[PDB]
Amino acid sequence: PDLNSIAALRQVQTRSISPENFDGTAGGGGRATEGTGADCARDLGPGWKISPSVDIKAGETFELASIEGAGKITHIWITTHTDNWRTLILRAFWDGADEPAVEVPYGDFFCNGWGVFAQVNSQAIAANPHGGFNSYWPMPFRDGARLTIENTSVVDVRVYYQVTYEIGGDHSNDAYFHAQWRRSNPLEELTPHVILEGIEGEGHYVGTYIAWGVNSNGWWGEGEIKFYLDDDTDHPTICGTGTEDYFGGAWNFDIPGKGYTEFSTPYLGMPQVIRPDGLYVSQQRFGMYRWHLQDPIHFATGIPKVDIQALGWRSGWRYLPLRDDIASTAMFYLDRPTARRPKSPSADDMEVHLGTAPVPDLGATPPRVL
Amino acid sequence: PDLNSIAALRQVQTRSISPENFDGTAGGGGRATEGTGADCARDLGPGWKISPSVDIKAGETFELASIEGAGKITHIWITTHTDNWRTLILRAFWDGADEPAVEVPYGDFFCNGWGVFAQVNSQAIAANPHGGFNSYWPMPFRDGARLTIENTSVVDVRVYYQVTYEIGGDHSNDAYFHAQWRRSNPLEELTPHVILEGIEGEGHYVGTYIAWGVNSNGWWGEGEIKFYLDDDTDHPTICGTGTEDYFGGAWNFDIPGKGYTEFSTPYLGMPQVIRPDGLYVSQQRFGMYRWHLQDPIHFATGIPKVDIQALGWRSGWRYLPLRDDIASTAMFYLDRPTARRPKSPSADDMEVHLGTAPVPDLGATPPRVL
Amino acid sequence: PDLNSIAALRQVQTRSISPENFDGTAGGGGRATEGTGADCARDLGPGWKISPSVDIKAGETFELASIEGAGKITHIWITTHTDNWRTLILRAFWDGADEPAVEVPYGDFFCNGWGVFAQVNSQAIAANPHGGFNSYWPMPFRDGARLTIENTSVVDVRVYYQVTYEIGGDHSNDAYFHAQWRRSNPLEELTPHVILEGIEGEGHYVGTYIAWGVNSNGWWGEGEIKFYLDDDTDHPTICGTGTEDYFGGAWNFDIPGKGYTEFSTPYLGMPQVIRPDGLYVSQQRFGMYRWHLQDPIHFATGIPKVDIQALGWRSGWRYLPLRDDIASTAMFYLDRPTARRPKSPSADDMEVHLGTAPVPDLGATPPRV
Amino acid sequence: PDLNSIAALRQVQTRSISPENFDGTAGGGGRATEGTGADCARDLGPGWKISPSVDIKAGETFELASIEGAGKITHIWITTHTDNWRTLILRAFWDGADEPAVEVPYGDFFCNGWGVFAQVNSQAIAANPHGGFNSYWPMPFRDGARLTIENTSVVDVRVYYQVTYEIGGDHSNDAYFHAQWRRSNPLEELTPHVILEGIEGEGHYVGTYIAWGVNSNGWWGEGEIKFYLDDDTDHPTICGTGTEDYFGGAWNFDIPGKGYTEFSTPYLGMPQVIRPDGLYVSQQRFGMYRWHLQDPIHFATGIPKVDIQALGWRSGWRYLPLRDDIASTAMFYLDRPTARRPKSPSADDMEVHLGTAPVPDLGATPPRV
């Protein structure tokens, strides 16, 4: 429900999967006698926070949640240290499918793909101090749900999480939640950055998060977003007017006398502006989201292409093709649990620089000395 | 309705009770010739802000709103000076019930339990400069409604209010809105702070505001929330992983280089961080809220217990049971107009220090000096 | 002697026990070839700071001093790191007794019960940069003395110390030095904090140090101190008028426009004000001492009770009973080497949070991790 | 006793007189059911700070302490709001005498004659935040003692106090404590300010506190102190070399690059420097004390005169006789309970401006409007 409909009596059950209730059973929480907090509770009884988190060994995948039957995820809360935001891969599989519908680097799913905490005050995503990541995207499913997180790094990783969902609804006409990630670094000359390609089915596009690192001086966001829907081949159905325009800003996000200004509204934001520090943090980077909740982009047959140009300015008032560092996360609902995906994100494609030192390992927490 | 459904035509009437229209009648507003504004308008006349507020004498209860028939409150606005935020009790009675379904200290109901204004940008609660307290919790009723505000303080109190409601909808399947408040100060050793106890009926839990003052050094919010629903006894169905975790945050609310950081999002917030001033304002305090609107916690026959652990840190990585000052406000919808309640809040249990002086009466507005 | 009487020739001997002369014997100092400094002097010979300190293993007790016969301790210097100020227990045993007359956490004995250095300029106690702890309380004894320090913590600790004493002169009529510790956290509703209880004998009360952490807003120091002496039962002989009053301050220690002001005088002080930093050091705390040296509180048959009220302010000009964090150290002289004392301090009720980080182990030196 | 002698056992009783124990009797404290704190304790039970203070109505005198028999006051603690430091007169009468031995404005007794708080860390006098006034001057008597506070102001005042004393000692060769006050505003030209005059008996001079407000530019402390003792007539036995000199400073109290510097040591101090604010607080004022404790100034048959010159500088390296505002408090011990005194201080001669506003009533707490 929502504020408007919260009062209606509904025959629904609410369940919640955490490290204190791995399977989310009724009456099954807080029973652990082993866990990451056991030694901490050694002078207290059982039931005093024995199992708040899990450790995922380097290279391994952990099953956050396994649900049987029909249901709908209504709220995901999760945290881990910033160092892992671009080493963990978050995946969701609906209805027993062998391929995931959601396959995203952890940080980007919460508009935090740079490993530097940015506050996000939106409706679908809340990202709160410090690295408290919340997803309210409804994720309904008809015949099972699997959520996993893969630690592609060389170090062991600690993760806290809480997956809340509903049982007892009819999801026969609910679509499946999908999310996909692509990174161009550096984008090829005069080539749009692909956001989505080759999606088949009925559904609607509902979200874009972009992490953009700029390699040219001047304004970098002239490029237009383009939605090729259904029958479209060589020209899109929805064509935009700029990068900041798409994300609801205008005129370079530039408030006279203040510069680039972070903002974060229910459907539109640029929650992140990273400014170089004159030493080893040398890349100017941006994070921007737009949710199409009141204005979804429906498609009856498919989405052949969603892409966005990367244009700035050069002398003589000419557009400048940008060789920039662009990562997109596209959110969409579909009447199937799988669709064409890009190649799985590798450790190497995902990597951003860890700290503020000259070497990632020197600014990791704690530093890595080998 | 909401933004998505606001265009639809509906056979519904809107009414609003205020000191300028005490009973809400149509054509009934602005007729006062006596009131708190009458002398202010002695050179004007009737119709020029004659009756904007009410004066509630010390000890006495004022009936904000009496409504007959079926209806639904859609928006409450109310204000009063900060000195009264923890001396007034807000109450709501549905369907002619002898007992209140809402029984809350005034400030807590708007996430402001400490008497120090804090901005709240949430969906259900908006608290604005300076002490503009707004509630958008829908409160449906089938056979009448009464709202009251009790002045438990030794001074007369001024209150402005605007209670907006609808007539003409079907509430036979709408739950009733409830809210309950409990404070433990200091929390007993090894004792979860009880948020909600013994609720019988069908319904769903939708909101927590906690006012927390900390009596140990170090981090204070390791403790987990536990929801015992339906048949639960010894173990909860939903077990949390931490106090900041439950409220959408992570890692102590601690942004590196900034410390505790206030935030306020549609469903999650720590709107308030009170820092000691090194003189008479010596208690470090927090206010936190979570609304379970997209993700309500349902129950079919009851809520035996909701509670939250108060755990900090001791040497040797040991949880420290905290003897802290913890006040909780719990919001839930129920299919009955009454339910098991804590003891009624009293002047002594609600009291927080007034102002910044060594004596509450010195810092009151105006100073009492009696 | 003192400044007034220092010129007099006296048939007295001065000795001094330190890690460089463990038994304090004439000509016994500086002989070590092993000790905590030996390797530091590997390129120098012996006699170059070979044994300046001792290491005390986790859990273990170390005998600082053992003196045979009659004497008087005249000055104790001692130091150790911040993290050990509320983990070490200092004890003194007089005349071969099995029960100690002094049983006090290390830091409280030098007005430093919070593990944060505060300068103390008093006559009996001098606490100097950084953690140079000095006691000049004279401690006479007739038939032996033992000083011990117990490491109740889980780590090993370094201690430097120097215990200076005198042999000669009659302690026929010199009382014994006693010191006892009690902490209420949180204090019971509307209940005085006990400072001293059930003491029997002849003597005089000479010292109070209190470490006070406040859990209510407003002014916390209205409570009066009360001395029940000799035949007293339900009412005291000496009844104070406030907490800051007892400690020689007034009007909340609050100098207008500057707030709480630390001071330290020969007999009266508030040497420590700890203000919260708005992050993990969230407790506002105080350190206060009064030495009754020119104005001893005598008793002839005992001290039934010494207590102090914990009172602040509530709405309506009402006292507010304070559920506060109060630790007291009482100093008194007694005509017996033993007295009835509280339950020994444990590691747990002594513990104060270490450092400024979210977990004590993260703020320890070095971090425990 | 003191630190050097604190350990000795002594057949002495300690008593303390306060608003909570008006007569100091054993088992007598904390019994009140009426008092200034009774309404404050209305929600608590008996014994919770019912009687911590006294209200002295405008114009009236209040008897702080009345003691019968032999005894010795060992410590006085007292406080009241700064507005009253120069409207209250503190008096002490020994052995039933009809005239006081101590007759001093309240603030001056504690080196605070200007109504602006100044820390004093001295041996005999401790003045602590904010207005905690402490005297450790021992005051022996042989046949009773009376301590009074006179409120010469037109408003009611609140006082908190604690008078601690001993019984048991033999005071038959203990002198009586005396203190006297004299103000010259403005001092007549080329006329020494009289500190003490015509004292008859055996004793010793033990203290000077001077409150000095300067009405000429340049350095104001050239003038030197003179003690006329015993058979002295036209010339003194002790002749000092300067005003800062007498108070233990040198070269104008002026540290290069810092100006006048406050300091408070066990016997010597300039605890107070008051700098004009450029508006209504326009008088540059100083507070200075010297205790002659280790160096008492002895007399066998009396003190004809103690005085001090007020000399500054004019052009041509000539002394400038100063028309200055000089109040002194002389402490001395005498073998008699009474001595020759100045006129009692009046409200008008004691008055100092209250606050910082144009009119004293506007700067009082609260304003008298």
Author numbering:
A (entry chain L), B (entry chain K): 2 to 371
C (entry chain A), D (entry chain G): 2 to 370
List sentences from the manuscript:
In this study, we identified four enzymes (two GH183 endo-d-arabinanases, GH172 exo-α-d-arabinofuranosidase, and GH116 exo-β-d-arabinofuranosidase) from Microbacterium arabinogalactanolyticum. These enzymes completely degraded the complex d-arabinan core structure of lipoarabinomannan and arabinogalactan in a concerted manner. Furthermore, through biochemical characterization using synthetic substrates and X-ray crystallography, we elucidated the mechanisms of substrate recognition and anomer-retaining hydrolysis for the α- and β-d-arabinofuranosidic bonds in both endo- and exo-mode reactions. We propose a d-arabinan-degrading pathway for Mi. arabinogalactanolyticum based on its gene cluster and four characterized enzymes.
